[PDB]
């Protein structure tokens, strides 16, 4: 714990942070994504949240289209592992 080697042990998949409009979508239905790749940019309550790519896996499909309302904690991208 002191060395913080196991600090980053937690892993998870992408999810919607909040309920609000979706400003932009950067992920196609079928594509290969790398680490840190922007998935979607969502504007809610005078604040823009950018969703990063968790792993390097390819995307099977996207769930939300341009300018849609996405509820909080809802899947956005069907994501494959590394």
């Amino acid at each position: 714990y002191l060395s913080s080697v196991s600090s980053q042990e937690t892993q998870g998949g992408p999810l919607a942070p909040m309920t609000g409009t979706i400003e932009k979508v950067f992920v196609k239905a079928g594509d290969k994504v790398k680490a840190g790749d922007s998935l979607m940019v969502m504007i809610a309550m005078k604040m823009e949240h950018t969703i990063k790519s968790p792993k390097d896996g390819t995307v099977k499909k996207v769930f939300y289209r341009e300018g849609a309302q996405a509820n909080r904690h809802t899947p956005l991208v069907e994501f494959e592992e590394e």
């Binding site: 909040m18 309920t19 609000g20 409009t21 809610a44 309550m45 005078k46 309302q69």
Partner: protein
């Protein structure tokens, strides 16, 4: 043994004197104008707004207050003139809110009710000031608060004067929480939709009552939700009494309509389990020996003339009995002991310019009253404060400071009434607003300013002339007139009682004939809280 015969104050005025006739006429005209303006304010926001409000099946705020308090009980409304011509083109009757002290289930309570007919209940800065003043009064006098909430949140165009500062909208929630922590009951009745901000009021209250399909609590309204997040939802599904009672838990009681909500509020106030206890001696009440309307003749409307404050004292105290203290020292100040509705009071009134002896006498009397735990009543009629080389050599300012410190450090209930002028540091020395009296009322003939208009004009003219002479520049008489006249006009406008009451600088303008009654009520409301001991600073001898 209380059978000793005691001489009484008061003399029969000369009703045939022309001065009495003129003074009576002027005061009657002033009172009639005040009554007409009060009626127009009572009319409310407007006819169309009232019709729409009734069409929704809701009661007007004054009807709500009438049905809430005990039957036939008197109601003491505060700051009826808030917002009177305060804003250039917007009419805000009563400040858009109604604050008062009433009797619910035999308990003195502070009722604060939003007026939904004035801009949909939006909060103007004067509305926030009025609500904060009412909350401060309730805190000081330890009175339960009842908020009949029907508001549209802060008024957006004036947001810079409503949201951010210390004495702005957040102080309402701060006071609510603080008074909740001191076992002072908070009851919020949600009579209508609260868009935002007002949704916190039921949340922070000790007990809630909400109407079924009228009251709807939501942190952000459907327009605000659409603007911020974009989600679309109806008001009832966003708020609603059913949706709040059933799973949210915000609401504590569920009411069919306004009448049921008021009945539930009365039941809650009964269940409060509180009993008033008095820590002062009580004697049987007795009416004064002279009619109160004669004050119109005695006082009049012209401030240039002078009258004996003993006339007012004899017209307001019980049985016209008054025990003067140090009658011949500092004659310009009148200090003594009396009783109003059985409550003992120490009366301090002005009868001229304040001298060193008057300040010393006032300090001594304030010390005595604080020692004996007796409420204090101040009557301000200030021609000015004594100024002069021989007075400065005798420390007239230091005696004024003595009186100011004594008044400020006092802990007994203090009630101020401005029956005439109030200028300079004399206003501070006679328990002005800055010194936190429990109540402050003014008569329709009062005048309040830093000084007279002509005095300020002369001071400014002398300053400018001396500065120009030192610079070496000519200062013509036309410049003197151009400097003087606007100052005279501005000081004339800003001294009007209606100007001072539009802003919350007092608790209302009162008919002199009602004075006694009002005082009684106020003193009653002042006796709910226990009287603490008084700690004084350094008396600069």
């Amino acid at each position: 043994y209380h059978g000793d015969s005691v001489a009484s104050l008061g003399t029969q005025p000369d009703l045939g004197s022309a001065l009495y006739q003129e003074n009576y006429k002027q005061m009657k005209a002033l009172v009639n104008q005040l009554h007409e303006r009060v009626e127009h304010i009572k009319l409310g926001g407007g006819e169309k707004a009232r019709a729409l409000h009734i069409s929704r099946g809701k009661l007007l705020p004054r009807e709500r207050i009438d049905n809430l308090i005990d039957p036939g009980s008197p109601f003491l409304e505060l700051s009826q003139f808030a917002g009177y011509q305060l804003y250039d083109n917007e009419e805000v009757p009563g400040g858009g809110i109604i604050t008062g002290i009433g009797r619910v289930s035999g308990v003195e309570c502070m009722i604060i009710a939003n007026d939904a007919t004035v801009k949909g209940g939006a909060y103007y800065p004067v509305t926030v000031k009025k609500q904060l003043r009412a909350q401060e009064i309730a805190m000081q006098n330890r009175l339960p608060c009842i908020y009949l909430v029907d508001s549209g949140g802060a008024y957006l165009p004036r947001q810079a004067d409503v949201f951010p500062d210390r004495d702005h909208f957040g102080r309402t929630f701060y006071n609510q929480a603080i008074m909740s922590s001191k076992n002072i009951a908070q009851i919020a009745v949600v009579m209508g939709s609260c868009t935002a901000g007002g949704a916190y009021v039921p949340a922070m209250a000790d007990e809630n009552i909400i109407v079924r399909k009228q009251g709807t609590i939501f942190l952000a309204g459907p327009p605000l939700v659409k603007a911020a997040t974009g989600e679309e939802v109806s008001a009832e599904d966003l708020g609603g009494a059913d949706l709040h009672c059933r799973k949210s838990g915000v609401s504590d009681h569920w009411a069919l309509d306004d009448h049921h909500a008021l009945h539930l509020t009365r039941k809650v106030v009964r269940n409060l389990n509180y009993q008033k206890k008095l820590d002062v001696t009580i004697e049987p009440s007795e009416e004064p020996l002279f009619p109160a309307d004669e004050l119109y003749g005695i006082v009049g409307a012209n401030l240039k003339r002078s009258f004996d404050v003993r006339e007012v004292i004899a017209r307001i105290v019980d049985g016209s009995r008054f025990t003067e203290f140090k009658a011949f020292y500092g004659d310009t100040l009148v200090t003594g002991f009396a009783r109003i509705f059985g409550y003992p009071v120490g009366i301090v009134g002005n009868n001229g310019v304040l001298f060193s002896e008057s300040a010393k006498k006032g300090t001594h009397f304030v010390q005595l009253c604080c020692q004996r735990n007796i409420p204090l009543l101040f009557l301000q009629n200030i021609t000015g404060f004594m100024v002069g080389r021989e007075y400065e050599a005798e420390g007239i300012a230091k005696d004024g400071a003595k009186m100011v410190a004594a008044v400020a450090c006092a802990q007994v209930p203090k009630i101020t009434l401005i029956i005439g002028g109030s200028y300079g540091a004399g206003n501070y020395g006679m328990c002005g607003r800055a010194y936190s009296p429990r109540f402050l009322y003014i008569w329709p003939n009062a005048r309040i300013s830093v000084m007279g208009g002509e005095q300020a004009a002369n001071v400014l003219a002398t300053i400018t002339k001396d500065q120009r002479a030192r610079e070496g520049k000519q200062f013509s008489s036309a410049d003197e007139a151009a400097l003087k006249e606007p100052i005279i006009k501005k000081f004339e406008e800003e001294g009007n009682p209606y100007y001072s009451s539009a802003r919350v600088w007092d608790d209302g303008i009162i008919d002199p004939a009602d004075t006694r009654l009002v005082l009684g009520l106020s003193f009653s409301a002042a006796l709910n809280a226990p009287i603490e001991k008084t700690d004084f600073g350094i008396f600069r001898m």
